[PDB]
């Protein structure tokens, strides 16, 4: 800090009003966009559809 | 065929003689499930 934290930015940003879509990882570097895309990289439920 | 002999669509002279409620047809397909 004080910059560095990421409290101050998100702060001066005004997302605090909306940080209900805080998105785990939410930082400067790779956003959610990003953090989205890279966890795709880390289909079986098995639901039984009705096909009507 | 011997037997049914034993007892004894129009269409132009021209194609004469020559070889010839909105439910879809398959409804509830089968359930592919994701797996």
Excluded: C, W
Aim: positive net charge; without cysteine; proline residues 5%.
């Amino acid at each position: 800090g004080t910059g560095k934290k990421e409290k101050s930015r998100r702060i001066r940003e005004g997302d605090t009003k909306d940080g209900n879509l805080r998105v785990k990882g939410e930082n400067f570097y790779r956003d959610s966009k990003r953090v989205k895309f890279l966890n795709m990289y880390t289909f079986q439920d098995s639901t039984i559809p009705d096909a009507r | 065929a011997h037997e049914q002999s034993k007892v004894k669509d129009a269409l132009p002279t021209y194609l004469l003689d020559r070889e010839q409620k909105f439910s879809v047809p398959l409804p509830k397909v089968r359930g592919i499930s994701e797996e």
